[PDB]
Amino acid sequence: LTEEQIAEFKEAFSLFDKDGDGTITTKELGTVMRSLGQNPTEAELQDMINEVDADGNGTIDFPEFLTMMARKMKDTDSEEEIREAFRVFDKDGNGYISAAELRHVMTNLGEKLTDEEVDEMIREADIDGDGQVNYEEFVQMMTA
């Protein structure tokens, strides 16, 4: 386990934890999912959270979030949701996520990232070196 993998999980947690209180609620999960073209019901949001909510408190904290990711890395069923996430980042549908597309999507998600931070994200996910993130590279970024 490296500092960087922790920092990537932390970056992902803060994207869902909109108010920074340390827990992800159904409302925060719901607003992030709608920003990615989804429309989950109140019942689906509660069921999604209950699957990963180890205690009964109804919200996801940082350890639960990490356990959620470790289970999903062992269970290779969630390809569909990664494909659906790819569709939102790849705005023009050409098979590549450009830095401009990532910048636009992160700004939509209420994220104040510098242009260098956006570039860093593209470069870290980029495997072939073309300066863009194709589907295969997006999968590897999501699943490690």
Ligand X SMILES: Clc1ccc(C(c2ccc(Cl)cc2)[n+]2ccn(C[C@H](OCc3ccc(Cl)cc3Cl)c3ccc(Cl)cc3Cl)c2)cc1
Sorted by sequence, the CB contacts under 8 Å of residue 119 that are 6+ apart come out as 99
Q: Is 79 in the site for Ca ion (CB under 5 A)?
A: no
Q: Which is nearer to ligand X, 48 or 104 (CB)?
A: 48
* 20 CB-side CA count, 13 A: 3
28-31-33 Cα angle (round to 5)? 105
Gaps after residue numbers in the chain (C–N over 2.5 angstroms): none
Query: Taking CB under 6 A as the rule, which mask of x and - marks residues 99-128 in contact with ligand X?
Result: ---x------------------x---x---
7-10-16 Cα angle (round to 5)? 150
Query: Taking CB under 6 A as the rule, which mask of x and - marks residues 22-51 in contact with ligand X?
Result: --x----x--xx--x-x---------xx--
Residue selected from 25, 30, 103, 138 as contacting ligand X according to rule CB under 6 A: 138
Binding-site residues from annotation for Ca(2+): 17, 19, 21, 23, 28, 53, 55, 57, 59, 64, 90, 92, 94, 96, 101, 126, 128, 130, 132, 137
